[PDB]
């Protein structure tokens, strides 16, 4: 059986551990809270006392910690990475991926690849569950069979930072959808409506909007901001969402969207489509 080490046994790390044991790995684990390995012990996992001991146990090291600062802290006293391949599945920024890749290279690592898991723990290991991988193609090819334990991989780039770039863009879309969905369900529930019946009404209309995301992308690329749905009109609709909510005693999200649309109107872009908001963001480092 191939020896694999895993650092991190949180919600996603434990799911990774179970996938690696099911695929036939000899697994060594480490977690700050060592008790999170308990369900792995009857399955034959070994628990390392320290990160260094965990890394010493295997030639392939998978990491899945909260963030890349925690990865750097955890690898602090891991002096010898010669012969080791690092597979980092920890969310972070593009430059954080560069920082961790450089750290492990300085300690003699053979390769670093980054992955962004685009599913939740309970679906990890299913073929529909995608993980985006970035890093040298030779390293991806060497790890692809091990990685198939967690589902389908997609090699998106040889640049080690690109999985995190794409992760952050995809999680932006997901965060916006969830912000809008939480607002919608708060309104519907406070009004005495049934959330499940509402979802049956809303899901197909969301599917339609999903099919326009590509249309918007092309217009953004081509700087085409003229259409039939101007920002002034969308902002009026958002102000009515606030008031609908307030009347029901419900709080309101979507404030950054109101603020960037309001400023677009002040700047003379009120007749533009929401594509016109993209340059509002790219031209200024500001939290709206």
Ligand X SMILES: NC(=O)c1ccc[n+]([C@@H]2O[C@H](COP(=O)([O-])OP(=O)(O)OC[C@H]3O[C@@H](n4cnc5c(N)ncnc54)[C@H](OP(=O)(O)O)[C@@H]3O)[C@@H](O)[C@H]2O)c1
Q: Which stretch binds ligand X (CB under 6 A): 5-13, 52-60, 186-194, 262-270?
A: 5-13
Q: What backbone phi and psi angles, to 5 degrees, belong to 4? A: -130, 140
Residues in region 49-78 near a second copy by CB under 8 A? 66-67
32/144 Cα distance (integer angstroms)? 28
Residues in region 177-206 near a second copy by CB under 8 A? 177-191, 193-196, 198-206
The DSSP secondary-structure symbol of 119 reads S
DSSP letters, 136-168, are -HHHHHHHHHHHGGGSEEEEEESSTTHHHHHHH
109 to 128: interface string for a second copy, x by CB under 8 A: ---------xxxxx-----x
**54 makes contact with ligand X (CB under 6 A):** no
Instruction: State the binding partner of 145 from ligand A1D7O, ligand X, a second copy, none, CB within 5 to 8 A by kind.
Output: none
Residue 161 neighbours by CB distance under 10 Å:
20
Query: Is 31 annotated as ligand-binding?
Result: yes
Q: How far apart are the first and last CA of the chain?
A: 52
**17 makes contact with ligand X (CB under 6 A):** no
**2 makes contact with ligand X (CB under 6 A):** no
Angle at CA of residue 84, ends 79 and 108, nearest 5°:
50
Residues in region 245-274 near ligand X by CB under 6 A? none
Contact call for residues 171 and 147 (beta carbons, < 8 A)? no
Closer CB to ligand X, 148 or 232, in the complex: 232
List residues near ligand X by CB under 6 A: 8-13, 31-33, 36, 64-67, 70, 73-74, 90-91, 117, 120-121, 228-230, 232-233, 237
């Amino acid at each position: 059986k191939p020896h694999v080490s895993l650092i991190g046994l949180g919600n996603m790390g434990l799911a990774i551990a179970n996938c690696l044991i099911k695929s036939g790995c000899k697994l060594t684990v480490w977690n700050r809270s060592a008790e999170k390995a308990a369900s792995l012990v009857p399955q034959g996992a070994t628990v390392a006392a320290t990160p260094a001991e965990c890394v010493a146990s295997s030639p392939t090291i998978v990491i899945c910690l909260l963030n890349q600062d925690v990865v750097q802290q955890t690898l602090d006293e891991v002096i010898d990475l010669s012969g080791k391949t690092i597979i980092n599945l920890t969310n972070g920024t593009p430059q954080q991926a560069v920082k961790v890749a450089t750290l492990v290279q300085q300690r003699g690592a053979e390769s670093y690849i980054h992955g962004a898991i685009m599913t939740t723990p309970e679906y990890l290991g299913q073929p529909s569950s995608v993980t985006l991988i970035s890093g040298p193609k030779t390293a991806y090819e060497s790890q692809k069979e091990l990685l198939s334990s967690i589902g389908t991989t997609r090699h998106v780039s040889d640049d080690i930072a690109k999985a995190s770039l794409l992760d952050n863009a995809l999680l932006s879309v997901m965060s916006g959808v969830f912000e809008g969905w939480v607002q919608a369900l708060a309104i519907v529930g406070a009004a005495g409506e049934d959330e499940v019946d509402f979802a049956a009404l809303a899901s197909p209309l969301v599917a339609s909007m999903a099919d326009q995301l590509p249309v918007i992308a092309g217009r953004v690329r081509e700087k085409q901001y003229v259409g039939g749905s101007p920002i002034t009109m969308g902002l009026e609709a958002l102000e009515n969402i606030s008031e609908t909510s307030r009347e029901l005693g419900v709080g309101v999200l979507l404030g950054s969207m109101r603020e960037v649309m309001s400023e677009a109107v002040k700047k003379g872009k009120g007749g533009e489509s929401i594509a016109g908001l993209v340059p509002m963001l790219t031209e200024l480092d500001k939290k709206w």
